[PDB]
Structures are given as structure tokens and as C-alpha cells.
Amino acid sequence: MPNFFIDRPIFAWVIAIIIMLAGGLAILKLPVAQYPTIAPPAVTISASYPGADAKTVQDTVTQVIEQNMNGIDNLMYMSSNSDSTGTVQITLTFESGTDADIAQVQVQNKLQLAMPLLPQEVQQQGVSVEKSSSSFLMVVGVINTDGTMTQEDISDYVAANMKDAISRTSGVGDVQLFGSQYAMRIWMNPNELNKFQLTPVDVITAIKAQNAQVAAGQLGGTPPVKGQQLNASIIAQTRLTSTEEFGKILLKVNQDGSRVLLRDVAKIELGGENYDIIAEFNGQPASGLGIKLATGANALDTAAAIRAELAKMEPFFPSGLKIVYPYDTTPFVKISIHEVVKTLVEAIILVFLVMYLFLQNFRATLIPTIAVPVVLLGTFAVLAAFGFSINTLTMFGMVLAIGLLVDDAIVVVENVERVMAEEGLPPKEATRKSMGQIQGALVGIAMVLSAVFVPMAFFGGSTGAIYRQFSITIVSAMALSVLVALILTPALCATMLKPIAKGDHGEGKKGFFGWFNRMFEKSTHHYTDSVGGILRSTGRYLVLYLIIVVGMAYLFVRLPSSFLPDEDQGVFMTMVQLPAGATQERTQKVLNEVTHYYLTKEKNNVESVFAVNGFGFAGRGQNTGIAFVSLKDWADRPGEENKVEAITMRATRAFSQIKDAMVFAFNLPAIVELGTATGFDFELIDQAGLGHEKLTQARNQLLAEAAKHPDMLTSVRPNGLEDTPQFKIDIDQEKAQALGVSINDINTTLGAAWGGSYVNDFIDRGRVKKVYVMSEAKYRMLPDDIGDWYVRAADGQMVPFSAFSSSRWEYGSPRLERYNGLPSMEILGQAAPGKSTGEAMELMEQLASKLPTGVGYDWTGMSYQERLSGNQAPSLYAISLIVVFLCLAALYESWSIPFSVMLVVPLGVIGALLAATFRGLTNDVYFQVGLLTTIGLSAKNAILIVEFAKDLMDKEGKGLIEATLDAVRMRLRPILMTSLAFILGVMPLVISTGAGSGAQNAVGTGVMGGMVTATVLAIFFVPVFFVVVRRRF
Amino acid sequence: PGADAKTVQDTVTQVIEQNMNGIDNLMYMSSNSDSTGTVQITLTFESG
Amino acid sequence: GSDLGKKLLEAARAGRDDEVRILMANGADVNAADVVGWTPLHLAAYWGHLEIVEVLLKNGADVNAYDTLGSTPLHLAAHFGHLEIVEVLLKNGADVNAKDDNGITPLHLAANRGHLEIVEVLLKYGADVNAQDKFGKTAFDISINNGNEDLAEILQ
Ligand SMILES: CCCCCCCCCCCCO[C@@H]1O[C@H](CO)[C@@H](O[C@H]2O[C@H](CO)[C@@H](O)[C@H](O)[C@H]2O)[C@H](O)[C@H]1O
């Protein structure tokens, strides 16, 4: 193939041009996102039951739905929470590879058929089935700064005037409103109701009759009387549209003929559908939109399109209304792209500098400058064909591949130059001879590198989807690189390189280059003399090699593992947890104090605090809240002390002092779904109808035993909520029947008043909205208020609630969990330092085996995969190891020689571990992929050394030592050139601080450490490997 | 049944359309709401 | 309220004997109460922690404390079938005839759940078999309505 293209440079250029056009096209059309999809597909079913307690939700909604989740394909597991905010969420998680749309439609369809089994009020609210996702492209906050709007006003403005246009914006896949559109709020007063012998039942009946759409028909409708001249629709009653109309609803006509209107027994106003969340932004009322990227969209274009849409709404904003951007992943992604592009460009300039330094002519310098960009462009084309996106992972895959691509260019060009100087052959014939020396090796190398990288595409679950991004990116780049090395670069060398006189090594040049040349030829002799001495004394080097191998294993076993490094993403969270039963007002006081700290103590770093009172991650309610902190741009936070980790640490320390509240700050995970590499996710399960209290006791028994193994388990804790006091009210049926009071009037009076009731819909400025009745706050606050509510008996008497009821305090659960359809309690924890998660999990199982009869367990989330596709690695690297050996055996036509190459593996790994251990880094995915690329490159170096030596022995009848010395002499320069260029090129990543430096440091340090030791060690050890292996066999 | 075009549009058509976002390969959407209370919304997708 | 008080309310409820022990040594308020008026003794009696009930009483707990609805620890112990706690409470002066706001007595509650041994203990300490709740019901009325013949026999 090289010979073919040496004589057909134009054909080679055409292939190059096609690759470049395909790549250029790919780059224009490639989706861009921070991360590709990684978590397995999950579908969430959400329902609301206004005024329902957790047990009511679970036993009338959750169990019924769960019991119908049958006949759905590829389900791994199902889980649910039923809570005292009247909410249920059931999450169904599917096998990786499941079509998410099909999973969702199967779920929705089984639900549809369960709907008639659900309470009327739940059917009325509706049950949502949605694809579960945790990543937002951005969060647009909307605030009012002149005190003229409440958060309810803002939410309705956003819903009516902003949300739909954002939803229609190019690239946006989903939009969530942080609040609701208005509802018509009827706030009842029990004293007025009793005054007129009315009840919420009467209110509800009047609203249903007087706010309604009524069908009529037509004038002159078919079939008509012939001769009819007109046909027109009859419009009868249509829905109310205003608070004023609602106030005028007629409830009763007194005997004196006076009228009782709804406004006489209730306050009427537009308000929110719910009042559980209070949202503030720097202390001001707030709403917002949570926006997600559509499939295959471009994150950068979508963000810009959203901002453009927002800009044209701006002129129509009510006074005081303002857009803020507390969260936007895009600026971060932009920086990642610039940084990667910058790295690739500098790498190409470095190759230019090193090529010129050693080869000292611009033509040689031109060749890699063309070849590398052609490979990179082609790689994008292949990614496009694989359906990949430009994302954090794929982009770092490309820089992890840089050494490999640069090495192909350098190896081909350098070898031609060597041949010309050593033989006086003209460029064309030198290129032919040169390619004849390396082409077989290049193909063998392509197979070997495929064997190293492809297996990583076969891990399962979430980690597998991550490895797969790097694996396909690197293998694609590597394959294109070898194609280009066999097709384009030989054509270029033959047509662009100038002749070199035999024996000319530039030693007679003037100034710097003559000096460098004389110096470098001298150093090469020192090197070969040294290798000669080494080879007179291989024994001690075998001992040194074992020392290295042992130190590697030692270093490796003590390096803690993680997934992906945290970043200063310009935002972080702070959690606010008050004791159970604490009220919204108490939580608001803590949030205010939190917000005040950031705008005061972190004045220089913090742009805004977005405080969400009433929202929590593992349970909602009045006693929980979150403060989402947005920082100024990195550019104005110079110094390790003004970055997230630092602010965070200080924050949590300052709050350690808050009285009756747990408050603390933390960075965001790179990808939420991965939890901690170290953490586990355990489910305790009621397998025998034991009930909530007994499950709780067993949970506690488990947690107490875990706590006695700090050596293995740390922070073993429940993920959910503890039981709390609840007010149990018993209706006396006998007394109700004696008084002539119906249970139905009793129960709707109670629920409508104290829990609220969705009555029907009305139309507010052309948009359909809900109508709710509920007591005014002051009549539903305390037990004594119960007796202020009256029900009308059949005989017209008003009977106080206290006449037919009794009450007592008891405990019950504010959040009931289920797992695969059975009562459950989720338990989180992590392996103690120096301990594997597998070990921690094994203990948990041991402890779980001693719990009361009927209590079982299961592993879910990150742990589910562990118990599964964590049983694959050494099986995959065993295959990799075997294929590599086989490819080498074919290359060298020997079962023994391949060992002399494989021995090289530890040489780079030791330096990567040293650098990572020393900088206090972890064994994460970036470190791991870099190990592969480092190993790949050292292997390639060794393959060429061994190929040259072997050929010298086979073809020129040279002795073992003689051939080895000559081979190592020839490979010195190109090995050094590549190492120099790569090491410098990856250096910026190593010292990088600022945005995305977490990932940059992770890929740089391991790579730089590995390249140092691989380079220094290999040039002395591979000749040892080769000699000892040949002597042995 | 029985609703006029504007009632149907406000209570049905717009409610559905505002949820017809973020569907793959959607080229355009068109709808009509009429005096018989009938609504038809048609979504047309990219060829292929 | 006090911080030690809160810790005691939690320890009592969870049945952490040793923590209670230490809390008693440090003077944690045995008369602490949460929002619904439950003392450590209410909690211990409800969740059935016998040893804590005894420690609390030795440390001056009010055996007859009542919550915001008028219920005492004896009510709780009787209702949830904690026989030995019932006996200890009574040994320590618990009011056998205490009525909550609904006129409900510990005897009503034990009868309602069919706790026969607890019913016998209550009668032994002088429980008023003819006490009526706000609806005019006695323990016997409850027994027959529930169709508990054994209990109905006892209350005769
Ligand atoms: C240039 C070419 C490059 C070559 C690339 C080839 C890579 C192919 C990947 C193979 C698939 C890996 O994943 C697959 O996982 C299961 C286990 O989870 C393996 O099965 C293995 O694991 C289990 C558990 O220890 C054993 O009980 C089983 O006997 C064993 O064979 C499969 O043998 C393996 O194939």
C-alpha cells in the first residue's frame, strides 16, 4: 500500500481531501453536550392526591399502580415513595440499551388501564409518566425586584407568557416551571359558613353548577324542516373567567329574600396551586424554568437560542421583572472546547518545533503538520457515523490519543530521514526502503492497540457507557492514524523531503545546530555504550524490573479510586434540614441566615443565592430546604481559596454552629447517577407482610450492627424519613347516624377545609386553570380549630365536628418506600478508607443475614451494577492480553519474542502511579484511559525496537547483541522526539487551574508521569527484555 | 361535545400543543379547532 | 426547651438505654416535652421501652404527665399492649382512671385492642368499669361491639 501511494501522491491527496471534507462536515453537524447519555433508561410515574397522608397515597395509589406494572419488557427494578405532601413517585429502571420511548409507552399503557382503579381525585389531578433525567442545560430564574409581584404572580406570568415560547425554541427538549400557573383560590371561613347553615359541600356544589361549560345544540340543525333559512350554533353557559364572578356565585337565598354569595363566606383570589415551596433569589420572590437539551441538539446553539428568545420577551415584562441565570452549563462547555482545541494546536506546534530541532528543515516539518489534522478531522467523521457527540469524554479521548497520532507522523518521517543520511538514497527510494522496514510493524501495532482499547467498550452499565466513549474515540483515531501512515505520509515524504548526502549528520553545521548535532551524536554513543554495559550485566536489571513491578502493585493497591473529578462548575448546593415537625417559617429563618452568610461573608465570590424552602432530595416537607449558590466567573475568583471546594469547606464550618438545624455545603458531582465510587445503595425489604414498624425495627437493628464495624463501614444511614406525630381523628358512626349527619358530608367538609379540594376548571385570560376550595389558614392550624367546622344534618341543624369525633396523637410515616412492589427502606453507606466496596457490601450482606424472620434485602442503583457488571474486568484484560500476544506472535513469527514487548507494560504504569500518588490524585477513568494510551505508546516503541533488531538478525546475519545495539541506536531519536513533543504538550493540562482543571489534571498527570518513566526506562529495558527472552528461548 | 371553537381551543388544543415540544424529527405542526367541538392536531416529521 | 431535653426525647423514643443513662447523669430534663406534649415517659411507654420507663421514673419523671389532648403514658402503654410498663406505671402512682379530652380511659383503650391481661391489671388497680367516654360508652360496650366474648366475660 505504501509503495502504491508513493507512486500515486495525487491519489493519496484525494483520499486526504475526502477525509478532511467528511471531517469538516461532521464538525459542523456534530451535537455538542457536556456529557452523553450514561444512566440506564428510567421512567417515572408521578401522581398527586391533595391533602393525602403517606399511607393514604400508598394504599390507594401506589400499590394499585405497582400491581399493574406487568408485561413490560426489560425492567431491571422498580421503586417508589409515597409521602405526606400527598405525592407518589414510582421509578422504573430498564436494562442499558432499552429503547427509552418504548419503555415509556409500555409503562404509560399499563398505567392507562389501572386509572379506573384509582381514587376520583387522583384521576382528576392526572398521573404523569415521564422519562427520568437529572441534567439541566440551564435554569432561568425570573424575579421581581420592585416588590410588586409574589412568586405566584411570577410563576403565572412565566407560564402564560414565557414557557411555551421557550418550549418551542430550537434545541430545547423539555421545560419545567418552578411553580404553577394561577389557580382560583376560594379560602373558606367556617364562622360565616355556619352563620348561614352552609358547608364546604354546598360551596363545591354551587361552583360545579355555576362554573361550567354546558352543551346546547343548533338552530336549523339537521335534519331540518325544509325551507329553513338559518343554521347557527346555540351557546349556553360557559366557564367563569374572573375572581369577581366567583365572588358572585349564589349559595343561598334567605327567607327575607337576602342573598348569600360565595364572597360572603370566603376570600377569593388568584393564587398558587400549591404552597409547599417558597422560592427566593437573593431574598426576592422568584420563579424560573428548568430547561433540558433535546436529543441530538447542540448545547451551545440551544443556549444562545434561548437567550435570544428571552431577549425579545423583555420589552413586554411588567415593571420589576428580571431574568437571571443561576445555572448554565454552556459557558463551562465552551471553555472545555477552547481548552481542547488549544491543547491540540499547541501539540501540533510542539511537533513542529521538535521536528525542526532534530531534522532542521521545514519540509520534514510540514508532513506531520498535514497528517495529524487529517487524522483528527477523519476521527470526527467516524464519531459522527457512530452517532457520537462532541462532549467532555470524547474530547478528552482525542487528547489522550495525541501521543499516538503524533508518533505515527514522527516515526514515518524520521525513519526516511535516517535512511537517507545512512545510505545516500534519494527521497523516493529511501521512502520505499523505509516503509518496507516499518509497514508490517505499523499494521501489527494497529492490531495490538485495537486489542488494548476495544475490550474497554465491553464493560456493562453506566461505567461501560463512559469507557465506551473513550474506547471508540481512541480506536477510531488510532485506525485512521495507521491508514494515514500507510497512505498519505509516505506519499508526502517521497515528494517533499529533499536528498541527504550519505554520512551527513549536520555535525559540520555552524552555530546552534552544528553544536546540537555533534552533541546528539555523542549522546547516542554514550547511550549505546551504556546499553552495552547493561547487556553485559542483565541479572541485576531483572532484579530492578521485579522491584519496579512490586512497587507498581504496591502503589496501585493504595491509590484510592473514584469515577470523575469534581469541578468548580461555578455553582454549588447547601442543604438545610431542621428537626422533624419543624414549620415552613422556622426553615425560612435558617435559609435567610444562610443566604445572609453568602452575600456577606462570600460577598466577593457569590453572585446569588437561590433559596428553595420546602424542597429536599430524600424527602420533602416544611422542615427541609436548599440554598443553590451561584458564583461570579472564575476570572474574578483568583486563587485556590476562592474556588468551590474552599468556599464550601468554609461555609459548612460556619454553619456547624446553627442551633437546631443541619446545614452544609457541597460541590456537585460531575454526573449525579454515579454516586460515590466507594458508596453503596442497599434496600431492606419486608418479605412477609411484617409491616412498617417491624421493618423499622429491623432497619435499626441493622444500622446498630453496621456502626460496630467502623473498620469496614462508614456513614451507614437511612436515605428516608423517620416517623413523626400525626393527629388521628375518629368519626363516631353511631353518633353521626343518630344526628342524621352523612359520612360523606363529614369527610368532604374535613378534607376540603383542611386538605383543600380541586373542584373544577375556569378560564383565566384564555388559559384553562384550576379552582381550589380550602379553609383560610387561621381556621385550620390547631386541634381546637376542628370544632369550629360545622356539618348540616338531614334535619337542618348545624352540628359541630366535635360532637361526632374524637382524637389522639400517634406516630406514623411521612414517607413510605417500596422496592419491587414490597415495603422497603433504602440504606446508604460507603466502604471505610482502604476498603473495597465489594468488601463493604459483603459485610452488609453478612449483617443482613442475622435480621428478624421475614426481612430480606437487595442491592440497587450503583450497587446493582456492581453485583453484576463489575464481574467483567480481568476477564476483558485477559482477552486483551491474549489477543495482544497473538498479534505479536503473528508479527514476529515467534511464540517467544512477543514477551520482550509485553514486559514493557509496568514501565509506564509505575510513573503514572508515582505522579498520581504524589499529586494526591485518584485512580479515576481519566487516569485509567491514560494508562492505556501510555501503555499503548511504550508498546509501540518496543515493537519497533524489537522489529529492527530481529530483522537485523534474520536478514543481515547479525549477532544478538550486535543487532540489539544497532536497533536501539536507530530508535533513540524518534523515541525522544515523540516523548519530548508529547510531554510538553500535556504539561499545560498538568499545571492547569481554573474551569475544568479537575479533568485536565486527571488526564495530564498520569500521562506525564507515565511518559517520563516509559521513555527513560524502555530505552534501557527493552534491549534487556529482547536479549533475555531470546537467550531463554 | 357541545363546545365552540374558541372554548375547544383554550381547553384542549393549546393544552395538547404546549406539550408537543421536544419530539424528535418534528418538521411542523398544524391544528384546527371547530364549532362541533372537534380538534385535530397534525405533526409532520422529517422524511425518513 | 433544652438541648439535653431534645436528646432525651430522642433517646427515650429510640430505646437507647445507655444514652438515657448518661443523660440522667447529666441532668437532662425528664420533663421535656415536644409540640404535642409528649414527655420522654410518653415516648418510652408508646414504643415499649421498659428499662427506660423505669429509669425515667427513678429520675423524677411525672408519671401522670398529659399531652395536649389529655392522654397519659398509661393510656399509651395500655393501648399498645405493653403489660409490664402498664404494671410499672401503676406501681408508681399512674392514675388508673385518667380521662383524656375525649373522656377515654386506659381501660377503654386496652379493651378496644383486646389486651386481656392489661384489662385485668387495670381492674386490679381500681379501674372504673362504669366510666363512660364522651359518647356514653364503657369498656363493656366496646367489648360487645368488637365481639370480644372473652373480654366481655371479664367485664361481665
Ligand atoms: C482487535 C480485536 C480486539 C478484541 C476484542 C474482543 C472483546 C470481546 C468482549 C467479550 C465479552 C466480555 O464480557 C463477557 O462477560 C461474561 C461475564 O460477565 C464472561 O463470562 C465469564 O464470566 C463469568 C464470571 O466470572 C464466568 O462464570 C464465565 O464462565 C466466564 O466465561 C464472558 O466470557 C465475557 O465475554
Ligand SMILES: CCCCCCCCCCCCO[C@@H]1O[C@H](CO)[C@@H](O[C@H]2O[C@H](CO)[C@@H](O)[C@H](O)[C@H]2O)[C@H](O)[C@H]1O
Ligand atoms: C532522556 C532519557 C535518559 C536520560 C539520562 C539517563 C541516564 C541514566 C543512567 C542509567 C544507565 C545505566 O548505566 C550503565 O550500567 C552498567 C552496569 O549495569 C555499566 O556497565 C559497566 O558496569 C557493569 C557492572 O557494574 C559491568 O558489567 C559492565 O561490563 C561495565 O562496563 C555502564 O557503564 C553504565 O552506563
Ligand SMILES: CCCCCCCCCCCCO[C@@H]1O[C@H](CO)[C@@H](O[C@H]2O[C@H](CO)[C@@H](O)[C@H](O)[C@H]2O)[C@H](O)[C@H]1O
Ligand atoms: C497489553 C495489555 C495491557 C492491559 C493493561 C490493563 C490495565 C490498565 C487499565 C486501567 C484500569 C486500572 O484499574 C482497573 O480498572 C478498573 C475500572 O473499572 C478500576 O476501577 C474499578 O474496576 C471495576 C470495574 O467496574 C470496579 O468494580 C472496581 O470496584 C474498581 O476498582 C480498577 O481499579 C481496576 O480493575
Ligand SMILES: CCCCCCCCCCCCO[C@H]1O[C@H](CO)[C@@H](O[C@H]2O[C@H](CO)[C@@H](O)[C@H](O)[C@H]2O)[C@H](O)[C@H]1O
Ligand atoms: C441545579 C443543578 C442540578 C443539581 C444536581 C443535584 C445533584 C443531586 C445531589 C443530591 C445529594 C444529596 O446530598 C449529597 O450531596 C452530594 C452528592 O452530590 C454529596 O457530596 C458528594 O459529592 C460531591 C460532589 O462531587 C463532593 O465534593 C462530596 O465530597 C461528596 O460527599 C453529599 O455527601 C450528600 O449529602
Ligand SMILES: CN(C)c1ccc(O)c2c1C[C@H]1C[C@H]3[C@H](N(C)C)C(O)=C(C(N)=O)C(=O)[C@@]3(O)C(O)=C1C2=O
Ligand atoms: C423544585 N423546584 C426547583 C422549585 C423551585 C421554586 C419553586 O417556586 C417551585 C419548585 C417546585 C414546583 C413544583 C410544582 C408542581 N407542579 C409543577 C405545579 C407540583 O406538583 C407541586 C406539588 N406540591 O404538588 C408544587 O409544589 C408546585 O406547584 C410548586 O409550587 C413548585 C414551586 O413553587
Ligand SMILES: CCCCCCCCCCCCCC
Ligand atoms: C483543501 C485541501 C488541500 C488540497 C491540497 C492540494 C495540494 C496538492 C499538491 C499535490 C502535488 C503533490 C506532488 C505532485
Ligand SMILES: CCCCCCCCCCCC
Ligand atoms: C512479512 C511479514 C508480514 C508482517 C505482517 C505484520 C502484520 C501482522 C499482524 C497480524 C495481526 C493479526
Ligand SMILES: CCCCCCCCCCCC
Ligand atoms: C502463551 C505462550 C507461551 C509459549 C512460549 C513457548 C515458546 C516456545 C518456543 C520454543 C523455541 C524453539
Ligand SMILES: CCCCCCCCCC
Ligand atoms: C466516503 C465517506 C463519505 C462520508 C459520507 C458523509 C455522509 C454525510 C451525510 C450527511
Ligand SMILES: CCCCCCCCCC
Ligand atoms: C470541536 C469543534 C466544535 C466547535 C463547534 C462549536 C459550535 C459553536 C457554536 C456556538
Ligand SMILES: CCCCCCCCCC
Ligand atoms: C492461546 C494461544 C496460546 C498458543 C501458545 C502456543 C505455544 C506454542 C509453544 C510451542
Ligand SMILES: CCCCCC
Ligand atoms: C494496492 C491497494 C491500494 C489501496 C487502495 C485503497
Ligand SMILES: CCCCCC
Ligand atoms: C494493509 C492492512 C491495512 C490494515 C489497516 C488497519
